[PDB]
Amino acid sequence: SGFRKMAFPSGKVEGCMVQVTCGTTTLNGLWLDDVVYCPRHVICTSEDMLNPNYEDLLIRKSNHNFLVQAGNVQLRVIGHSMQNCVLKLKVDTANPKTPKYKFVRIQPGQTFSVLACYNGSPSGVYQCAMRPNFTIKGSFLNGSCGSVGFNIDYDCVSFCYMHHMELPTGVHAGTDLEGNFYGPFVDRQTAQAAGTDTTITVNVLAWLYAAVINGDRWFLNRFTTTLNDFNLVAMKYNYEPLTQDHVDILGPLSAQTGIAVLDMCASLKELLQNGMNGRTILGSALLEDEFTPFDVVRQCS
Amino acid sequence: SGFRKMAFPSGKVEGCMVQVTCGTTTLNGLWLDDVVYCPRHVICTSEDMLNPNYEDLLIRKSNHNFLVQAGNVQLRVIGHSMQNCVLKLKVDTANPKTPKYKFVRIQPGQTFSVLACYNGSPSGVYQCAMRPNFTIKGSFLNGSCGSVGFNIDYDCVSFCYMHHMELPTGVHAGTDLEGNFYGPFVDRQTAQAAGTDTTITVNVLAWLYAAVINGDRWFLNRFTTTLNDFNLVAMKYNYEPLTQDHVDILGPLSAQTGIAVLDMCASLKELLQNGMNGRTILGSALLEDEFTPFDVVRQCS
Ligand SMILES: *[C@H](O)[C@H](C[C@@H]1C=CNC1=O)NC(=O)[C@H](CC1CCCCC1)NC(=O)OCc1cccc(Cl)c1
Ligand SMILES: *[C@H](O)[C@H](C[C@@H]1C=CNC1=O)NC(=O)[C@H](CC1CCCCC1)NC(=O)OCc1cccc(Cl)c1
Ligand SMILES: [Mg+2]
Ligand SMILES: [Mg+2]
Numbered sequence: 001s002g003f004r005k006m007a008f009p010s011g012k013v014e015g016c017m018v019q020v021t022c023g024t025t026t027l028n029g030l031w032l033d034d035v036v037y038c039p040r041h042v043i044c045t046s047e048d049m050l051n052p053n054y055e056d057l058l059i060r061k062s063n064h065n066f067l068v069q070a071g072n073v074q075l076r077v078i079g080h081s082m083q084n085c086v087l088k089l090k091v092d093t094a095n096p097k098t099p100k101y102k103f104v105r106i107q108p109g110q111t112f113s114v115l116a117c118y119n120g121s122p123s124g125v126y127q128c129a130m131r132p133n134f135t136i137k138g139s140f141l142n143g144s145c146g147s148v149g150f151n152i153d154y155d156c157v158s159f160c161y162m163h164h165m166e167l168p169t170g171v172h173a174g175t176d177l178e179g180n181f182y183g184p185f186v187d188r189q190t191a192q193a194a195g196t197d198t199t200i201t202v203n204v205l206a207w208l209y210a211a212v213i214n215g216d217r218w219f220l221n222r223f224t225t226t227l228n229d230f231n232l233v234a235m236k237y238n239y240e241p242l243t244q245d246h247v248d249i250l251g252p253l254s255a256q257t258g259i260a261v262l263d264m265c266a267s268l269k270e271l272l273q274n275g276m277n278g279r280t281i282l283g284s285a286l287l288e289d290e291f292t293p294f295d296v297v298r299q300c301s
Numbered sequence: 302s303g304f305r306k307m308a309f310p311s312g313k314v315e316g317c318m319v320q321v322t323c324g325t326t327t328l329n330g331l332w333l334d335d336v337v338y339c340p341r342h343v344i345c346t347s348e349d350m351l352n353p354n355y356e357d358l359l360i361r362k363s364n365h366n367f368l369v370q371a372g373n374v375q376l377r378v379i380g381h382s383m384q385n386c387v388l389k390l391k392v393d394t395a396n397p398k399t400p401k402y403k404f405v406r407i408q409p410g411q412t413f414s415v416l417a418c419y420n421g422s423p424s425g426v427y428q429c430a431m432r433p434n435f436t437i438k439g440s441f442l443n444g445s446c447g448s449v450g451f452n453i454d455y456d457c458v459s460f461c462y463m464h465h466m467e468l469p470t471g472v473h474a475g476t477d478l479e480g481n482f483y484g485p486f487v488d489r490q491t492a493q494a495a496g497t498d499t500t501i502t503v504n505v506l507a508w509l510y511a512a513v514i515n516g517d518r519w520f521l522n523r524f525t526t527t528l529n530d531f532n533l534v535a536m537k538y539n540y541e542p543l544t545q546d547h548v549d550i551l552g553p554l555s556a557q558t559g560i561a562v563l564d565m566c567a568s569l570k571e572l573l574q575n576g577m578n579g580r581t582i583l584g585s586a587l588l589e590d591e592f593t594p595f596d597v598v599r600q601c602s
Binding site for chain 2: 001002003004005006007008009010011012014015115116122123124125126128137138139140141166170171172214215280283284285286298299301
């Protein structure tokens with residue numbers, strides 16, 4: 001029993017982390033087979049990064065401008081190319097620790113583990129959700145760019161995020177592994193900011209199910225609501241609307257607890273209106289929305 | 302910027318996890334060089350575990366009673382022995398992935414990472430603190446025994462916890478790697494329960510410093526208190542007394558923020574008396590006490 005914020009074991013991704021240095025900039029790369037993936041802004045100069053023309057910057061580079069270090073041994077770059085906002089460096093050595101992997105572009109509301117790295121060396125692991133505004137609330141210092149987010153599915157590593165920058169509110173923005181930014185962000189130092197966020201409703205409900213599985217019951221009631229009347233409450237409190245799709249995703253949790261989704265919605269509606277009144281749920285005094293239904297099932301087997 | 306619950310990268314410990322099966326029981330072992338460490342209650346039978354005599358149970362075993370699986374390959378046991386509440390199984394193969402390691406017995410208030418495992422296979426990683434009542438608030442299902450907790454210090458793995466059992470309140474109890482239980486607990490299925498807990502004061506203050514470093518300032522004030530008057534407030538709200546030792550440990554955080562420890566104590570005193578009033582600190586609506594000063598420095602560099 002017990003419910004914790006849980007990340008995937010990170011060993012498979014640790015074996016892929018390298019250091020990439022271009023000029024005066026140093027950050028992290030992902031070394032899979034004979035290619036290293038990293039953010040393209042590594043080729044930027046401190047002056048020409050208010051509005052860089054990356055095609056020009058890259059044409060002016062040669063393979064010997066990129067230094068790749070896997071642990072101690074230097075990796076020789078034999079080719080370079082750019083795909084969207086990620087740079088790809090061909091190296092003459094395939095990574096012997098390359099796991100089975102996939103590149104996946106995730107939907108807002110989904111979670112993943114982040115392996116924060118500095119200078120090619122893993123520093124820590126934590127769990128994150130793609131917020132509806134396509135930022136993540138991460139923990140990233142300078143030098144952390146190129147750290148990756150991932151999920152694991154029976155030793156297949158699904159990479160879904162590479163870190164690029166921090167926004168003015170302290171949240172973070174990045175790309176999928178094919179270099180497409182999540183959200184409307186671009187890789188120039190400009191005035192872009194996070195838009196207004198919303199709470200991930202299907203995740204709060206999943207976490208309420210985790211609470212029930214673990215003995216937290218004070219918030220339950222006999223009431224039940226409809227989908228329509230619930231979604232009116234959600235709008236008022238800045239919650240994402242609840243779709244039938246989400247109701248079905250919450251199916252297994254509903255069966256294990258015997259509490260129907262729309263029964264749990266009536267509990268959530270009451271918590272939104274009255275607050276918690278000095279009580280806690282799974283150790284928290286606010287409603288938690290960074291656990292997906294999958295995360296709850298995986299930990300509450 | 303940003304502050305997250307962060308575990309150590311777990312790859313070095315993943316390479317040490319094995320499955321140990323004795324009779325009908327299966328749990329996890331730690332494979333370091335040519336020895337496997339696991340809880341001794343693996344040799345217990347469902348009947349004789351209300352009050353087992355482990356010396357007798359072990360004398361009645363032979364090496365062929367223990368099955369050790371590292372991934373797919375079976376490991377042959379060539380010797381067995383017992384040290385306190387841990388069983389030690391000599392195997393004929395040294396673990397080629399043995400990291401640099403130490404066994405450490407930690408003090409209440411200290412944190413570590415847990416690699417939860419089932420059937421020798423890592424499942425997830427999370428952060429935990431040794432509570433003052435020598436339990437941990439973990440996430441553990443059946444089959445998780447033998448999962449280990451650890452800290453890392455420049456590729457030296459310090460193992461400090463091995464998991465043995467769950468208590469009636471859903472919290473967890475275990476040993477150091479030499480098989481001495483934390484707290485007064487014993488490895489028989491009896492009526493032992495967690496004693497009353499207290500809040501880890503030096504950790505709350507460290508987390509308030511993390512808040513300041515990350516821009517959360519609404520709780521600061523111009524007041525300052527003495528150690529004596531603060532400790533009177535701590536007692537009233539079930540907080541551990543604050544020692545001069547702790548004040549000195551909080552030194553670096555005090556300097557980086559410019560806020561003296563006893564200045565931050567006057568903020569904490571006011572939060573204890575008035576609550577948060579609908580405000581949050583680093584995303585939480587209650588005071589967090591499972592970050593040590595070291596954890597804050599490591600993440601707020
Ligand atoms: C890369 O390592 C670094 C990670 C940032 C630095 C602190 N937290 C992070 O997430 N990324 C940057 O410094 C980017 C580089 C820009 C280059 C040109 C294209 C757009 C990205 N800049 C950035 O994050 O600026 C905002 C910021 C906020 C706080 C502190 C710093 Cl150093 C920068
Ligand atoms: C070992 O894998 C298992 C881990 C427990 C099971 C659920 N959470 C955990 O942490 N440990 C046990 O089942 C122990 C075994 C006892 C054997 C004899 C000596 C003392 C330990 N028992 C135990 O935890 O009992 C309490 C309990 C509470 C909830 C659910 C279960 Cl299955 C057991
Ligand atoms: Mg209800
Ligand atoms: Mg003050």
